[PDB]
Structure formats: structure tokens, C-alpha cells
């Protein structure tokens, strides 16, 4: 429940009209890796995906 | 920091060959203050 | 002192497994297997480790945007934050990344690699420091723990242990590298250690040997 | 069900651009190298159903 609303807010700052602006949304990309936690464990861990 | 601040800005134009009107603005504003550091070293040497 | 260009050095990690700390290096054979494996250096009293693979050298060391202009495209000293290319003294090939698929991990290992790659896609790391006493633009202490990241791929070089043996890759956390200043510039017309040579005896034409081949004295 | 699909979702338009600079660059190649290592397009294609 939590999760899906900060992620709804990252939606409008990747694109605003139409698929563009890609500065910051390369280093969203980038910064995001760096937090494996942030996927949700039942994909992308150690366990099983 | 500073220097590799510049040392870093002449790679991203090593590739061109004329630099815009933009890039010769903020150029000459780090330029000013680094001058400006080198100034104060000096005057806390000068007189031994 | 301090690390140079023109070194030749090895890796070293260092993970416990019967309570006890084993160290383990990286080294491949070259010619034959593409794959990199460990090998142990714990027992030197009683068991030989082989050093002849082991053996690296630092040939260049560039900033990141330095390297991204020359892939459109002296002596230094390293500093974290900045770029390096391995080179494996022995087979004279670069280390590298691959693309393939193994341990079945459902996962984003990447086994680790040397092929050939001279030209600069997946050739290349940058190094960070471990805590907080160090930070970006410094010297690099010799014996100093490092963190290697790819540039291409983005990944830490993981010593990824698994149900089976002790594996290397780039998949999931963090793993820290001791550097060893193996040897630096030598001076001419010595000798050093870790060199393959020959021993005569007597005046001119005269040498140590063994038994030739296809023989059942078994080279005693 | 509404978290993964909207993660998915995030990861789909921070893709690195349009042709417009995947056909003419080689940067944004390194980004699309990453995001699509992280969703096999096997199950991919068995998920719509």
C-alpha cells in the first residue's frame, strides 16, 4: 500500500508530455540500483524470483 | 575540487571546436574566482 | 608509498569458512578457459599456492569523462573515482565482464571474463573507497580497501558463494579487495624474484636438466 | 497485484528514449542494456493471459 503511492509520484517526474526529459530520469535509474531493497523481495534477492 | 571541476569541464569540450557564446560565460565566471584564491595564498607567505 | 601506472599487482579477498580466515585471490589460466576461478593461499607452510596466473598490471588510469571521450575515439597515480584497466601479465589478455549465464541464480551474475577487449566498452572499473575515513579525489594508500564497480554493466565484482564452491561474479553486494604491491619498476641487470631462467655450470657450455621425455622415470 | 505492475510501469517510460537517440548515440545503449536484463521477456509474454 505505501509503496505504490511514493511510486506513483516518480511517474511524473520521468516524463511530462509525451516520453521525454531523460536527464533526470537517467540518474533515477542509476540511483535506484544502488538500493536492491528496493524491489520487492519476492523478485530480485537471493531466494527465488 | 575546483581544479578538477575544470579539468573536467575542458574534456567535455575536447571533442568540439568552437566554443558557444554559453560556454564562454560560465567558463569565465571560474575562472575570476580561482584567481581571486590565488591571490589570498600569496598573502600568507609574503613577508616571510 | 603509493600505488603507480606500470605495477604489477594481485587482488586479495579474505572470507571465513571452517571459522577461520582463508585468503583468496583471482587468477586465470589464459589459453583455453575464458572463465576466472580462486585460489587459495592459506596453507603456504605446507601447500604451494601457484602465482605464476596470479600476477596483474596497471596500465591506465583516466578519469570517467576522460574515458567516455575516448570511446568516441608517463606515470600517474591513482586516486578513487577514477577509472583503471587490468591487464593479466602472463596470458597478456584484459580482464573484463561478460554476458553469460551460469549458477542458474535467476539473477544478474554476469560471470566474470577475459577475452580480448582492448577496444573500451566492458574493459574498464572505477574504485571507490569502503568507509567513511576516505573520500573521492585522494591518494591511494598502499594495502587500502577498495570497491570495484563496472563501467559498462554497473555491477560490484561479488565474491558469490552458493551452495557449491566459493564462485566469482557481479550480481548483488559489496566485496572487499586488498591490494598487493607485487613488484614495481626493477632494475636492470638483477635478478628478481618470480623470473624464468636458466642455470649453467662450469666455464662456456655446460647447464642443469632433467631427464628427457617419453621416459618411465617419472622427472625424479 | 497493483505494486508490481505499477513498478513495471515506472520501468517502461524511464526506458532511455525514443529512436531519436538510440539509432544516432551510444550512450542511451548502455541504459537499455540494464533495465532489459532485469525483465526476461519469456515470462514476460506468459504474463498476458
Redo the contacts between chains.
Keep these: 500500500c505505501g509503496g505504490e503511492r511514493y511510486l506513483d509520484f516518480l511517474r511524473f517526474a520521468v516524463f511530462v508530455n509525451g516520453e521525454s526529459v531523460e536527464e533526470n530520469a537517467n540518474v533515477v535509474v542509476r540511483l535506484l540500483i544502488r538500493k536492491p531493497e528496493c524491489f520487492g523481495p519476492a523478485l530480485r534477492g537471493e531466494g527465488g524470483s | 575540487r575546483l581544479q578538477e571541476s575544470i579539468s573536467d569541464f575542458y574534456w567535455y569540450y575536447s571533442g568540439k571546436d568552437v566554443i558557444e557564446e554559453q560556454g564562454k560565460r560560465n567558463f569565465s565566471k571560474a575562472m575570476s574566482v580561482a584567481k581571486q584564491v590565488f591571490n589570498s595564498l600569496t598573502e600568507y607567505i609574503q613577508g616571510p | 608509498q603509493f600505488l603507480r601506472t606500470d605495477d604489477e599487482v594481485v587482488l586479495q579477498c579474505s572470507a571465513t569458512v571452517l571459522k577461520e580466515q582463508l585468503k583468496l585471490c583471482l587468477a586465470a589460466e589464459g589459453f583455453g578457459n575464458r572463465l576466472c576461478f580462486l585460489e587459495p593461499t592459506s596453507n603456504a607452510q605446507n601447500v604451494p599456492p601457484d602465482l605464476a596466473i596470479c600476477c596483474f598490471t596497471l596500465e591506465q588510469s583516466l578519469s570517467v569523462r576522460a574515458l567516455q571521450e575516448m570511446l568516441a575515439n608517463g606515470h600517474r597515480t591513482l586516486l578513487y573515482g577514477h577509472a583503471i584497466l587490468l591487464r593479466h601479465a602472463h596470458s597478456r589478455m584484459y580482464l573484463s565482464c561478460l554476458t553469460t549465464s551460469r549458477s542458474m541464480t535467476d539473477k544478474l551474475a554476469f560471470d566474470v571474463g577475459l577475452q580480448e577487449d582492448a577496444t573500451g566498452e566492458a574493459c574498464w572499473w572505477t574504485m571507490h573507497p569502503a568507509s567513511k575515513q576516505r573520500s573521492e579525489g585522494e591518494k591511494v594508500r598502499v594495502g587500502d580497501d577498495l570497491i570495484l564497480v563496472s563501467v559498462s554493466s554497473e555491477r560490484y565484482l561479488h565474491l558469490s558463494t552458493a551452495s557449491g564452491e566459493l564462485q566469482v561474479d557481479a550480481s548483488f553486494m559489496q566485496t572487499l579487495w586488498n591490494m598487493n604491491p607485487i613488484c614495481s619498476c626493477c632494475e636492470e641487470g638483477y635478478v628478481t624474484g618470480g623470473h624464468v631462467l636458466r642455470l649453467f655450470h662450469g666455464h662456456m657450455d655446460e647447464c642443469l636438466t632433467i631427464s628427457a621425455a617419453d621416459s618411465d622415470d617419472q622427472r625424479r | 497485484m497493483?505494486?508490481?505492475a505499477?513498478?513495471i510501469?515506472?520501468?517502461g517510460?524511464?526506458?532511455?528514449?525514443?529512436h531519436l537517440?538510440q539509432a544516432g548515440k551510444?550512450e542511451?545503449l548502455?541504459?537499455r542494456?540494464?533495465?532489459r536484463?532485469?525483465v526476461p521477456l519469456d515470462d514476460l509474454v506468459g504474463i498476458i493471459s
Design positions: 497493483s505494486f508490481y505499477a513498478l510501469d515506472l520501468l517510460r524511464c526506458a532511455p528514449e525514443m537517440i551510444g542511451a548502455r541504459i542494456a540494464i533495465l536484463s532485469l
